[PDB]
Design an enzyme around this catalytic site. Sequence first.
Site, PDB file in Angstrom:
ATOM      1  N   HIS A 140     -83.573  23.273  25.401  1.00  0.00           N
ATOM      2  CA  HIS A 140     -83.348  24.739  25.378  1.00  0.00           C
ATOM      3  C   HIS A 140     -84.667  25.475  25.604  1.00  0.00           C
ATOM      4  CE1 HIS A 140     -79.467  23.572  23.809  1.00  0.00           C
ATOM      5  NE2 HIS A 140     -80.062  22.995  22.754  1.00  0.00           N
ATOM      6  N   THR A 187     -81.974  33.611  17.519  1.00  0.00           N
ATOM      7  CA  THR A 187     -81.420  33.998  18.839  1.00  0.00           C
ATOM      8  C   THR A 187     -80.783  32.834  19.571  1.00  0.00           C
ATOM      9  OG1 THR A 187     -83.403  33.641  20.111  1.00  0.00           O
ATOM     10  CG2 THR A 187     -83.149  35.815  19.041  1.00  0.00           C
ATOM     11  N   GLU A 221     -86.389  38.311  25.272  1.00  0.00           N
ATOM     12  CA  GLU A 221     -85.138  38.500  24.513  1.00  0.00           C
ATOM     13  C   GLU A 221     -85.073  39.930  23.994  1.00  0.00           C
ATOM     14  OE1 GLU A 221     -84.850  34.970  21.843  1.00  0.00           O
ATOM     15  OE2 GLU A 221     -83.439  34.408  23.432  1.00  0.00           O
ATOM     16  N   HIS A 270     -89.296  31.998  25.385  1.00  0.00           N
ATOM     17  CA  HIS A 270     -88.144  32.239  26.265  1.00  0.00           C
ATOM     18  C   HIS A 270     -88.691  32.884  27.529  1.00  0.00           C
ATOM     19  CE1 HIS A 270     -85.426  31.706  22.763  1.00  0.00           C
ATOM     20  NE2 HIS A 270     -86.507  32.154  22.120  1.00  0.00           N
ATOM     21  N   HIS A 324     -92.179  33.217  20.313  1.00  0.00           N
ATOM     22  CA  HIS A 324     -91.650  33.255  18.943  1.00  0.00           C
ATOM     23  C   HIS A 324     -92.422  32.278  18.063  1.00  0.00           C
ATOM     24  CE1 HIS A 324     -87.592  34.933  20.507  1.00  0.00           C
ATOM     25  NE2 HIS A 324     -88.552  35.857  20.409  1.00  0.00           N
ATOM     26  N   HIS A 334     -92.303  28.665  20.144  1.00  0.00           N
ATOM     27  CA  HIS A 334     -91.650  28.389  21.435  1.00  0.00           C
ATOM     28  C   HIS A 334     -91.588  29.678  22.219  1.00  0.00           C
ATOM     29  CE1 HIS A 334     -88.440  29.794  18.802  1.00  0.00           C
ATOM     30  NE2 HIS A 334     -88.029  30.396  19.927  1.00  0.00           N
TER      31      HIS A 334
HETATM   32  C1  LIG Z   1     -92.265  20.894  11.064  1.00  0.00           C
HETATM   33  C2  LIG Z   1     -90.771  20.485  11.093  1.00  0.00           C
HETATM   34  C3  LIG Z   1     -89.611  20.987  11.897  1.00  0.00           C
HETATM   35  N1  LIG Z   1     -88.285  20.434  11.679  1.00  0.00           N
HETATM   36  C4  LIG Z   1     -87.060  20.904  12.324  1.00  0.00           C
HETATM   37  C5  LIG Z   1     -86.572  22.131  12.087  1.00  0.00           C
HETATM   38  C6  LIG Z   1     -87.233  23.063  13.210  1.00  0.00           C
HETATM   39  N2  LIG Z   1     -86.533  24.305  13.449  1.00  0.00           N
HETATM   40  C7  LIG Z   1     -85.212  24.493  13.382  1.00  0.00           C
HETATM   41  C8  LIG Z   1     -85.014  25.849  13.717  1.00  0.00           C
HETATM   42  C9  LIG Z   1     -83.631  26.669  13.774  1.00  0.00           C
HETATM   43  N3  LIG Z   1     -83.425  27.061  15.077  1.00  0.00           N
HETATM   44  C10 LIG Z   1     -84.093  28.327  15.582  1.00  0.00           C
HETATM   45  C11 LIG Z   1     -85.338  28.833  15.138  1.00  0.00           C
HETATM   46  C12 LIG Z   1     -85.861  30.015  15.716  1.00  0.00           C
HETATM   47  C13 LIG Z   1     -85.070  30.651  16.670  1.00  0.00           C
HETATM   48  S1  LIG Z   1     -85.641  32.191  17.449  1.00  0.00           S
HETATM   49  N4  LIG Z   1     -85.353  32.030  19.084  1.00  0.00           N
HETATM   50  O1  LIG Z   1     -87.047  32.330  17.099  1.00  0.00           O
HETATM   51  O2  LIG Z   1     -84.819  33.209  16.835  1.00  0.00           O
HETATM   52  C14 LIG Z   1     -83.869  30.178  17.099  1.00  0.00           C
HETATM   53  C15 LIG Z   1     -83.378  28.967  16.536  1.00  0.00           C
HETATM   54  N5  LIG Z   1     -86.247  26.387  13.989  1.00  0.00           N
HETATM   55  N6  LIG Z   1     -87.204  25.473  13.829  1.00  0.00           N
HETATM   56  C16 LIG Z   1     -87.169  22.341  14.303  1.00  0.00           C
HETATM   57  C17 LIG Z   1     -88.358  22.719  15.303  1.00  0.00           C
HETATM   58  O3  LIG Z   1     -89.547  22.193  14.699  1.00  0.00           O
HETATM   59  O4  LIG Z   1     -87.390  20.862  13.823  1.00  0.00           O
HETATM   60  C18 LIG Z   1     -88.153  19.495  10.560  1.00  0.00           C
HETATM   61  O5  LIG Z   1     -87.144  19.040  10.299  1.00  0.00           O
HETATM   62  N7  LIG Z   1     -89.289  19.031   9.796  1.00  0.00           N
HETATM   63  C19 LIG Z   1     -90.565  19.502  10.034  1.00  0.00           C
HETATM   64  O6  LIG Z   1     -91.453  19.113   9.398  1.00  0.00           O
HETATM   65 ZN   LIG Z   2     -86.945  32.079  20.147  1.00  0.00          ZN
END
Ligand SMILES: Cc1cn([C@H]2C[C@H](n3cc(CNc4ccc(S(N)(=O)=O)cc4)nn3)[C@@H](CO)O2)c(=O)[nH]c1=O
Ligand SMILES: [Zn+2]
Length: 258
Positions: free
Chosen positions: A62, A196, A104, A94, A117, A92
């Site tokens: 994504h 988002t 966005e 977009h 973001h 990350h």
């Molecule tokens: C360091 C680490 C990461 N992970 C997981 C969870 C992380 N994660 C999940 C999501 C939910 N999705 C999301 C987020 C922002 C936006 S936005 N566009 O900003 O609104 C949209 C959707 N965000 N980050 C993910 C990335 O690192 O990996 C761990 O489990 N342990 C770890 O130790």
């Molecule tokens: Zn984002």
Amino acid sequence: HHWGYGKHNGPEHWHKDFPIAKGERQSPVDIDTHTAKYDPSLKPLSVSYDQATSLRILNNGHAFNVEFDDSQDKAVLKGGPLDGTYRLIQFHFHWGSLDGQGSEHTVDKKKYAAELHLVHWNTKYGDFGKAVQQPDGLAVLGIFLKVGSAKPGLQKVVDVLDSIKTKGKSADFTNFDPRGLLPESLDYWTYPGSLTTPPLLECVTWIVLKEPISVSSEQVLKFRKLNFNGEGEPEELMVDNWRPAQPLKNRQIKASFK
Ligand SMILES: Cc1cn([C@H]2C[C@H](n3cc(CNc4ccc(S(N)(=O)=O)cc4)nn3)[C@@H](CO)O2)c(=O)[nH]c1=O
Ligand SMILES: [Zn+2]
């Protein structure tokens, strides 16, 4: 879940699997600069990234995420609209297929070429997975990208993208300093919103900086060479991975600046 950004699985379809897509605090939104009101109750914003520990970069199909060690208070966001301490977990972007689209959030309906973001979670909830279940669980710092002069602090990201071309590829990405992606001013807009991307959880305090960063055409062209697909699948360029603006509904956007 087979959600994406295409005609058949894009933002207009997400509500079927994720009914909160039509919720009361969805993101992103258009920021009407004339309607946003200066808020003197906002405390100073504190971006403290001196001790940030980057670990890895991942193409998740994504976007790509630069992931941080969030096992201790290292890189944190505090102040502004926020109560307490929010730990950086990943950033990350977009971006668009063309320089005229990709962000966005929009500013008086203007779309930027891309949007960064920086995702942080509220340490009072102990872990990210618990934080996303809370209305004040996350703080996302949003930064617009326009095409002009190169952003030197971005080039290390750009140069590793060829090693993570396809979904599920990762690479070591230690010692990356996210301070190099910040504009000079921390003037911002803030409002309560959502993730988002699915699962679109209504857990985010949005902090969107007014001052964009400049990146070069060459830098963003390298984002557009990434793939949504996995290795040995038909090539689908990772472009236009942005959700459009959602209804503001019963929300006010506050400005940090007079
Ligand atoms: C360091 C680490 C990461 N992970 C997981 C969870 C992380 N994660 C999940 C999501 C939910 N999705 C999301 C987020 C922002 C936006 S936005 N566009 O900003 O609104 C949209 C959707 N965000 N980050 C993910 C990335 O690192 O990996 C761990 O489990 N342990 C770890 O130790
Ligand atoms: Zn984002």
